Amino acid sequence: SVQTAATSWGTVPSIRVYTANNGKITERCWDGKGWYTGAFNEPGDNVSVTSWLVGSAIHIRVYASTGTTTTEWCWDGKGWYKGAYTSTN
Amino acid sequence: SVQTAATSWGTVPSIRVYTANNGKITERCWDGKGWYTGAFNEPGDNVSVTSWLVGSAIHIRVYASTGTTTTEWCWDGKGWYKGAYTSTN
Ligand SMILES: CO[C@@H]1O[C@@H](C)[C@@H](O)[C@@H](O)[C@@H]1O
Ligand SMILES: CO[C@@H]1O[C@@H](C)[C@@H](O)[C@@H](O)[C@@H]1O
Numbered sequence: 360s361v362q363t364a365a366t367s368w369g370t371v372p373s374i375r376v377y378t379a380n381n382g383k384i385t386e387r388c389w390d391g392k393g394w395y396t397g398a399f400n401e402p403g404d405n406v407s408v409t410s411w412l413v414g415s416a417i418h419i420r421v422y423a424s425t426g427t428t429t430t431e432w433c434w435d436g437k438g439w440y441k442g443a444y445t446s447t448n
Numbered sequence: 449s450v451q452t453a454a455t456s457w458g459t460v461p462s463i464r465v466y467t468a469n470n471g472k473i474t475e476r477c478w479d480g481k482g483w484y485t486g487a488f489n490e491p492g493d494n495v496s497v498t499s500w501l502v503g504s505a506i507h508i509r510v511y512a513s514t515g516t517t518t519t520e521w522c523w524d525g526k527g528w529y530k531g532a533y534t535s536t537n
């Protein structure tokens with residue numbers, strides 16, 4: 360079966376839902392109207408997510424894994440880009 | 449594939465990333481500098497987390513499962529400890 364993770368913020372719930380389907384991740388978004396498709400689209404067999412606010416600004420971090428390789432895609436208000444997360448230190 | 453869970457708190461932020469790989473879970477932490485390895489080391493090929501703040505003090509609960517057995521692990525400001533959680537009534 361597919362794998363999903365979810366996060367959310369505000370009183371006016373915005374909710375993001377990430378679905379790992381067949382090695383591909385699709386983001387679903389809701390801002391109080393209808394659900395819609397977001398800009399997130401990255402490879403991976405499993406997902407986790409978190410989010411925080413700095414005032415009314417959301418930051419999201421998505422943790423996408425395939426095999427033993429975990430990648431982080433960062434959302435800070437502008438665009439998705441590759442984060443500096445690594446597994447070993 | 450590996451399975452990750454993640455949580456965070458604050459506006460810095462702090463981020464905890466737990467990974468289930470080969471029946472073992474290992475914690476990865478970030479508090480504004482680089483990523484680093486956490487104190488958490490528990491068996492489980494599936495993980496979930498949640499964290500809550502009391503003022504500025506973080507509390508974290510990790511849900512570590514193998515087979516049908518779920519063990520809770522707590523961080524409350526000192527050391528990790530085995531939670532009182534049970535999955536049945
Ligand atoms: C108002 O609509 C209900 O709550 C929203 C926050 C969403 O979770 C939506 O799918 C649900 O049907
Ligand atoms: C404004 O853009 C929408 O919301 C952001 C918080 C992200 O979830 C992004 O992928 C989405 O398309």
Ligand SMILES: CO[C@@H]1O[C@@H](C)[C@@H](O)[C@@H](O)[C@@H]1O
Nearest residue numbers: 420431433442443444461478
């Ligand atoms: C500032 O660096 C970016 O944001 C941090 C909160 C982390 O998620 C890090 O891995 C990422 O590269």
Ligand SMILES: CO[C@@H]1O[C@@H](C)[C@@H](O)[C@@H](O)[C@@H]1O
Nearest residue numbers: 464475477486487488506523
């Ligand atoms: C202070 O210790 C660090 O942060 C705590 C909140 C825990 O995540 C712990 O495992 C980690 O080593």
Ligand SMILES: CO[C@@H]1O[C@@H](C)[C@@H](O)[C@@H](O)[C@@H]1O
Nearest residue numbers: 509520522530531532533534
């Ligand atoms: C006080 O009890 C501890 O903290 C609670 C919030 C629960 O996580 C419980 O299972 C745990 O043993």
